[PDB]
Design a protein around this ligand. Structure first.
Ligand SMILES: *[C@@H]1O[C@H](CO)[C@@H](O[C@@H]2O[C@H](CO)[C@@H](O[C@@H]3O[C@H](CO)[C@@H](O)[C@H](O)[C@@H]3O)[C@H](O)[C@H]2NC(C)=O)[C@H](O)[C@H]1NC(C)=O
Ligand SMILES: *[C@@H]1O[C@H](CO)[C@@H](O[C@@H]2O[C@H](CO)[C@@H](O[C@@H]3O[C@H](CO)[C@@H](O)[C@H](O)[C@@H]3O)[C@H](O)[C@H]2NC(C)=O)[C@H](O)[C@H]1NC(C)=O
Ligand SMILES: *[C@@H]1O[C@H](CO)[C@@H](O)[C@H](O)[C@H]1NC(C)=O
Length: 215
């Protein structure tokens, strides 16, 4: 329980690293787990938590701090950045819920190599699909940080959506900055009902599913 030590956020050097840090979302959590690190540098992964009668018990926050995962690519001449969070359980009241949970938002900007790139759209994970916004509404943008809420509405489990309430930042690690042992684990580990969204199997399919523009 709470054994995984997160990666530190390295000081950004490349275009994509700098943009990754610049456009980190704010995450506000409502009645669920705080985000936890899913994997460590040695490739061990979180065991999650069994479902129980309280949505937050055991997962109010790691003694090691939190993590947010990032991965980016050009797609259809727009720059797409995925931010993903891992939670040890998703266990709402009245619902069966499950061990493990992965959520993500995809932020779309015009070009990462501008002094002030423009957010063009944003898509928030919703039970394997997305809620798509084009444009990303201004009231949910805090500087260059989209404001995201993790919450549940009966009769479905937790999901993400934009919000006007400012949350908090987590230490960001980008896919390429994790050691090969960690990427191997994120590529291969079975999280049951939760699917790791930025690993090599799923990332491009997810970016395509997240495309919010009326093309
Ligand atoms: C995802 O988030 C969006 C953004 O907040 C949600 O859309 C919003 O839904 C509410 C419905 O409660 C709309 O609220 C307004 O509320 C008053 C209540 O008195 C109503 O009278 C107004 O006519 C108006 O509908 C709000 O306009 C709407 N915003 C947008 C941009 O659509 C959306 O429901 C969330 N989706 C999920 C699945 O949770
Ligand atoms: C998920 O990410 C991991 C880590 O980046 C990828 O595993 C790494 O990539 C290849 C897998 O084909 C391995 O290289 C191969 O090693 C064998 C045995 O030494 C050699 O015969 C081949 O010529 C090739 O060099 C690499 O060792 C492996 N690393 C680890 C730690 O597993 C994996 O490919 C990714 N999965 C997907 C679906 O992309
Ligand atoms: C923007 O985020 C900060 C925390 O990062 C918060 O203190 C502030 O109230 C937010 N402002 C708006 C307008 O959302």
């Amino acid at each position: 329980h709470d054994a995984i030590v997160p990666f530190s956020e390295p000081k950004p050097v490349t275009i994509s690293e700098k943009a990754g840090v610049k456009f980190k979302p704010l995450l506000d959590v409502n009645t669920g787990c705080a985000p936890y690190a899913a994997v460590n540098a040695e490739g061990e992964t979180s065991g999650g938590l069994q479902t129980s009668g309280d949505p937050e018990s055991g997962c109010r926050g790691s003694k090691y701090g939190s993590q947010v995962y990032g991965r980016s690519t050009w797609y259809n001449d727009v720059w797409a950045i995925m931010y993903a969070w891992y939670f040890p359980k998703d266990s709402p009241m009245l619902l069966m819920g499950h061990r493990h949970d992965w959520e993500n938002v995809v932020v779309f900007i015009n070009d990462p190599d501008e002094v002030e790139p423009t957010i063009l759209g944003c898509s928030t994970s919703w039970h394997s699909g997305y809620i798509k916004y084009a444009p990303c509404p201004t009231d949910s943008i805090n500087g260059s940080s989209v404001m995201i809420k993790y919450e549940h509405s009966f009769p479905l489990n937790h999901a993400l959506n934009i919000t006007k309430d400012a949350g908090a930042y987590q230490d960001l690690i980008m896919w390429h900055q994790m050691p090969d042992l960690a990427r191997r684990a994120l590529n291969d580990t079975d999280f049951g009902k939760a699917i790791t969204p930025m690993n090599d199997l799923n990332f491009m399919e997810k970016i395509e599913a997240a495309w919010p523009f009326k093309t």
